[PDB]
């Protein structure tokens, strides 16, 4: 009990989350606010999705690279909308030892300015295009909002991809190709559904022509959260960094650029999605151990149980299924059950005397706790199919919750009702940037219906979904009363 999760996910989501990430050994806290340690179980997930994304961006001819952590004032300030957005959260190095630096230098919050400072040397003619680069690194955004492990941190691990193209068409195609890879990263590895859409003008990346986005939704507190992003930068950074190329007709042109990122926030979204009141729940593709084997003794005798459990370990490891046999003498079976449930292991296999006598074992799924007796010779196949089935169940259950978290409305008088039911709204909107602040202020004012002390009551535009319902001929904007343009998702958010 004391060693389990002692806050229910529905009753105290914030304390449940803290208990889950600590007791599963994902996260350790640190003496600098907003910075957290990724312990091995958390870093293993990152390596899994790193492996997947590398393999896929390789097919698009993107190549990994590594650029400096630091940027000079001269470079950092070249693109005005970019730096106006980041400048209050940029951390500056000013000293080495007790000596002042001759010039202060900034830590990257993102690397457009760093990388594009040298793109002009690499891109001189149409022969040099497309240029396609990625980095796996961390960046620093020194905000003073309340941090949350994985999802809102001052330093975070991510990849940032950056490409440059001879025209708009090719760059935009890559934007949406990357956006579908983020859909796959979340779906095939984290069993998380996302919504693709376009950011409103007030929410797009600074310096972007447009920002496409993958949005996730945390049903338990009614909060949307950006899962990944892929920007068409157009020629906006090419203008400011003078990234020009001579085209086939001997005319100077600006490159058309993209950048796109996805972070360890994805792990936090997975935890909040599938985690339950027993702790972490891992999709098998991001769990080091797919199976834990637990022995049960009453009280060859003890050697007979040990030999049998080791046989099952050999069967799984010979088939490339990593597993652990928990043969620790000092802890009860029920201790071990909780121990590994807490840590999110997908499958427990139990072996006691009655299972040995029947030449079977008990196979227990972490997601729904269903138990079944499997003969020894069918354990390999049953385990294989059950790992597939757990992932499918986690994803389908999550997708039903996401679907159920959207209410389509036509007037603002329906909005507050749905927000306080922890929903997002899909609403007809004129898309005028001026209305975004107005909507944020008024929904925050009317929220006077929240028990979160560190997240805003404001609802903001989340994304204009790529999948649009019909817009009836005279539908008005739900806020301004002007002709509505498209349907947009709004909600409270992280």
Q: Binding-site residues for L-proline, please?
A: 141, 231
Q: Does residue 86 interact with ligand MU5 by CB under 6 A?
A: no
Shortest Å distance, C-beta 198 to ligand MU5: 15
Q: Which does 34 bind (CB under 5 to 8 A by kind): ligand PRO, ligand MU5, none?
A: ligand MU5
Choice between 178 and 349, CB closer to ligand MU5: 178
* Cβ partners under 8 Å of residue 216, min gap 6: 186, 192, 193, 194, 195, 224, 225, 226, 227, 269, 273, 402
Round to whole Å and give the CA distance between 106 and 74. 11
Q: Does residue 212 interact with ligand MU5 by CB under 6 A?
A: no
Choice between 189 and 289, CB closer to ligand MU5: 189
With the C-alpha atoms ordered 28, 31, 33, 35, is the resulting torsion angle positive or negative? Answer: negative
Among 85, 16, 88, 42, CA closest to 275 = 16
Q: Does residue 226 interact with ligand MU5 by CB under 6 A?
A: yes
Tell me the three state secondary structure of residue 425. Answer: strand
Q: Does residue 200 interact with ligand MU5 by CB under 6 A?
A: no
The single residue among 75, 78, 82, 141 that binds ligand MU5, judged by CB under 6 A, is 141
Contact 457, 447 (CB under 8 A): yes
Q: What is the DSSP string of 132-197?
A: EEEEEEEEE----SPPBTTTB-SEEEEEEEEEEESSHHHHHHHHHHHHHHHHHIIIIIT----EEE
Cβ neighbours, 10 Å, residue 146: 12
Choice between 229 and 443, CB closer to ligand MU5: 229
Q: Which does 119 bind (CB under 5 to 8 A by kind): ligand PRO, ligand MU5, none?
A: none
Choice between 154 and 231, CB closer to ligand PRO: 231
Q: Which does 205 bind (CB under 5 to 8 A by kind): ligand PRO, ligand MU5, none?
A: ligand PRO
Choice between 210 and 478, CB closer to ligand MU5: 210
Q: Which does 423 bind (CB under 5 to 8 A by kind): ligand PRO, ligand MU5, none?
A: none
Shortest Å distance, C-beta 263 to ligand MU5: 3
Shortest Å distance, C-beta 458 to ligand MU5: 15
The single residue among 38, 164, 228, 309 that binds ligand MU5, judged by CB under 6 A, is 228
Round to whole Å and give the CA distance between 228 and 214. 5
**Where along the sequence are the contacts to ligand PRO (CB under 6 A)?**
110, 112, 160, 205, 229, 231, 259-261
Tell me the three state secondary structure of residue 476. Answer: strand
Round to whole Å and give the CA distance between 307 and 294. 12
Round to whole Å and give the CA distance between 311 and 376. 9
Q: What Å distances lie between residue 263 and 153, 199, 356, CA to CA?
A: 11, 18, 46
Shortest Å distance, C-beta 14 to ligand MU5: 14
Choice between 226 and 383, CB closer to ligand MU5: 226
Round to whole Å and give the CA distance between 172 and 304. 63
Helix, strand, coil percentages for the chain (3-state, nearest 5)? 35, 30, 35
Q: Does residue 34 interact with ligand MU5 by CB under 6 A?
A: yes
Stretch that binds ligand MU5, among 11-19, 94-102, 226-234, 451-459 (CB under 6 A): 226-234
Q: Does residue 156 interact with ligand MU5 by CB under 6 A?
A: yes
Shortest Å distance, C-beta 59 to ligand MU5: 22
* Cβ partners under 8 Å of residue 320, min gap 6: none
Backbone angles phi, psi at 347, to 5 degrees: -135, 130
Q: Does residue 263 interact with ligand MU5 by CB under 6 A?
A: yes
Among 227, 187, 232, 191, CA closest to 56 = 187
Q: Does residue 78 interact with ligand MU5 by CB under 6 A?
A: no
Around 161, how many Cα atoms within 13 Å sit in the side-chain half-sphere?
A: 30
Shortest Å distance, C-beta 104 to ligand MU5: 21
Q: List the binding residues.
A: 141-145, 152-156, 226-228, 231, 263-265
Q: Does residue 261 interact with ligand MU5 by CB under 6 A?
A: yes
Q: Which does 259 bind (CB under 5 to 8 A by kind): ligand MU5, ligand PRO, none?
A: ligand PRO
Q: Does residue 265 interact with ligand MU5 by CB under 6 A?
A: yes
Which positions touch ligand MU5 (CB under 6 A)?
34, 141, 143, 145, 147, 151-154, 156, 226, 228-229, 261-265
């Amino acid at each position: 009990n004391i060693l389990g999760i002692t806050s229910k996910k529905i009753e105290n989501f914030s304390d449940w989350y803290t208990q889950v990430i600590v007791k599963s050994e994902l996260i350790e806290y640190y003496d600098i606010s907003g910075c957290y340690i990724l312990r091995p179980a958390a870093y293993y997930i990152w390596e899994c999705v790193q492996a997947f994304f590398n393999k896929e961006i390789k097919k698009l001819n993107v190549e990994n690279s590594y650029f400096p952590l630091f940027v000079t004032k001269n470079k950092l300030e070249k693109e005005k909308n970019h730096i106006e957005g980041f400048s209050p959260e940029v951390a500056w190095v000013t000293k080495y030892g007790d000596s002042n630096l001759p010039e202060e230098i900034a830590i990257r919050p993102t690397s457009e300015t760093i990388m594009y400072s040298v793109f002009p040397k690499w891109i001189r003619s149409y022969r040099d295009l497309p240029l396609k680069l990625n980095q796996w690194n961390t960046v620093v955004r020194w905000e003073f909002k309340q941090p949350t492990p994985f999802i809102r941190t001052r330093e975070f691990l991510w990849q940032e991809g950056h490409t440059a193209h001879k025209n708009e068409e090719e760059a935009v195609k890559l934007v949406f190709d990357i956006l579908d890879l983020y859909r796959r990263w979340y779906e095939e590895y984290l069993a998380v559904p996302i919504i693709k859409g376009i950011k409103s003008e007030g929410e797009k990346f600074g310096g972007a022509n447009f920002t496409s986005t993958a949005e996730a939704f945390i049903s338990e507190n009614g909060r949307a959260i950006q899962a990944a992003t892929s920007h068409y930068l157009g020629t906006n950074f090419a203008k400011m960094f003078k990234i020009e190329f001579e085209d086939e007709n001997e005319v100077k042109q600006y490159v058309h650029q993209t950048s796109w990122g996805c972070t360890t926030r994805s792990i936090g979204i997975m935890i909040m999605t599938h985690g339950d009141d027993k702790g972490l729940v891992l999709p098998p593709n991001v769990s080091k151990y797919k199976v834990v084997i637990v022995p049960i003794f009453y009280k060859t005798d003890e050697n007979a149980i040990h030999s049998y459990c080791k046989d099952i370990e050999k069967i799984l490891k010979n088939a490339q299924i990593n597993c652990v046999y928990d043969d620790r003498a000092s802890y009860s079976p029920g201790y071990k059950f909780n121990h590994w449930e807490l840590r999110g292991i997908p499958i427990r296999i139990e072996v006691g005397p009655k299972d040995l006598q029947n030449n079977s074992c008990v196979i227990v799924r972490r997601d729904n706790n269903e138990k079944c007796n499997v003969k020894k010779e069918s354990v390999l196949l049953e385990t294989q199919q059950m790992l597939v089935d757990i992932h499918k169940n986690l994803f389908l259950k999550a997708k039903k919750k996401l679907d159920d978290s959207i209410v389509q409305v036509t007037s603002f008088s329906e909005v507050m009702n749905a927000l306080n039911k922890k929903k997002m709204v899909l609403a007809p909107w004129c898309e005028d940037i001026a209305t975004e602040e107005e909507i944020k202020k008024e929904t925050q004012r009317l929220s006077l219906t929240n028990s979160e002390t560190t997240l805003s009551g404001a609802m903001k535009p989340l994304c204009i979904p790529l999948d649009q319902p019909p817009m009836p001929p005279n539908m008005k904007c739900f806020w301004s009363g002007k002709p509505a343009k498209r349907w947009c998702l709004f909600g409270r958010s992280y």
